Amino acid sequence: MIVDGDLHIHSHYSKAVSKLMTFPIIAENAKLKGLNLVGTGDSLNPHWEKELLKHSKPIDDGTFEVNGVKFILTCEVEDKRRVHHLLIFPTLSQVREFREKVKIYSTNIESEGRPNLNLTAEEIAEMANELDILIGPAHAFTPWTSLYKEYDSLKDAYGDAKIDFLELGLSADSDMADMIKAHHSIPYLSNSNAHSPNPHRLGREFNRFEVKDVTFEEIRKAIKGVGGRKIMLNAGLDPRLGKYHLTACSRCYTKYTLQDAVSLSWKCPKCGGIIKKGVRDRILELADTSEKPKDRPPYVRLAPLAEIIAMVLGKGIESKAVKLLWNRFLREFGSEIRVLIDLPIESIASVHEGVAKAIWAYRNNKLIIVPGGGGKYGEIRIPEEILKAKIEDLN
DNA sequence: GTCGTTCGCTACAGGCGTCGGTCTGC
DNA sequence: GCAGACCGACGACTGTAGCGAACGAC
Ligand SMILES: [Mg+2]
Ligand SMILES: [Zn+2]
Ligand SMILES: [Zn+2]
Fold it and tell me: What PANTHER family does the record tag this protein with (predicted)?
């Protein structure tokens, strides 16, 4: 069976999130969006575990289900060097053991969903491999809290320890990450690290796996690529639409080149801020080889359908008209990815014509894109001739 | 025209380093 | 005067009350 999954969210116990990020709301949004599996997130917080046990019924000992949506134990933790790390747990006993093992190295583990662990990346990876916990550098290209912002390679970060995956993130895709030779030996993950159950947030990126049943062991075998199970697709947001794609400032959000950044010593002239290095320039810095493996699954660049509808209707992202159109589209069809890539444009025209034309322009890459960086999302704009034309003469 | 209905922009929140400025002891 | 210690503020880690203001069936 083929299943879509996003394995990186945060509960309402974390910071800078929404109070609507609870199990029922997340399950409803995932079921209405077209998502089969969802990572629990913040599994080290005991209150979140209590809410999971209350608002759900278990499948086995490491996979749960609520409102027809499966859930596996995941969590993001912070490093002593301030490096985000994503962890996947086999069962709940592993969660309890890992929690009780790091209480002496933390102070907010029992309070916040995203705990601060006073441990080294090598130490965290070793403790994870000790309990068969899957570990990866989550959004490892962010110039704020990532792996490549502090360390220069995976070996320098983990040392003798090993990992199991590597989250690409918003501003990255499979190819630019595969521009590193060592990355050829590690599977990729395209998650969201989303904080809101909004359509353009929850499940903006996901991974499509081929499995037999829906449990932790099947996901583990699909990640390791054994027993017929495998990760067959990585649906991700276009790298240009990320928050930190290009090297830009953190205050006025002005894009600068790497050469000008080094010349100005990372000091914004007409703003007085600290310009942060984008993921593209960081990857070009750590460029290793121009080759990439064949077994690498494809990465279909998709844009959030909510933002497409918002830019077509000429209204905001959280307005009522765009919500109505998005809900009618999800009712008439399947999921977001279906309308974004798979569904033909003549079928999309049955619900709305302008949205169909915009999706055609996105598939044909004629959609104008201005990249983002420093904390500002990338922006999309459709030309006027694509709007004032029909569908027949379009192609 | 009318008065509920909805938009879009601004402010602010809640809990570990980095970056300047300032004090101290020499 | 100055190296080094001490201090405060600032923001990721985004989401959303909320509030004039434009809107849209009567
Ligand atoms: Mg991406
Ligand atoms: Zn994170
Ligand atoms: Zn600036």
Answer: PHOSPHOHYDROLASE, PHP FAMILY, PHOSPHOTRANSFERASE
Q: How far apart are CA A48 and CA A234, in angstroms?
A: 28
Cα–Cα dist A223/A231, whole Å = 6
Q: How was this structure determined?
A: X-ray
Check whether residue A17 has its CB closer than 7 Å to nucleic acid strand C: yes
**Contact positions of strand B to protein Cβ (< 7 A):** 6-9, 13-20
Resolution in A: 3.1
The yes/no answer on whether domain A2-240 falls in CATH 3.40.50.720 is no
Whole-angstrom distance, CA of residue A264 vs CA of residue A275: 10
Q: A159: Cβ under 7 Å from strand C?
A: no
Tokens at A355, concatenated = 């949205």
Cα A117 from Cα A121, distance rounded (Å) = 10
Asked if strand C contacts A145 at the CB level, meaning under 7 A, the answer is yes
Closest to A125 measured CA to CA, from A137, A114, A135, A115: A135
A8 strand C contact, CB < 7 Å: no
| Structure tokens belonging to residue A178 | 């595969």
Judge contact between A130 and A161, C-beta under 8 A: no
The helix (H) or strand (E) run that includes residue A308 is helix A305-313
Instruction: Note whether A8 and A87 are within 8 A (CB).
Output: no
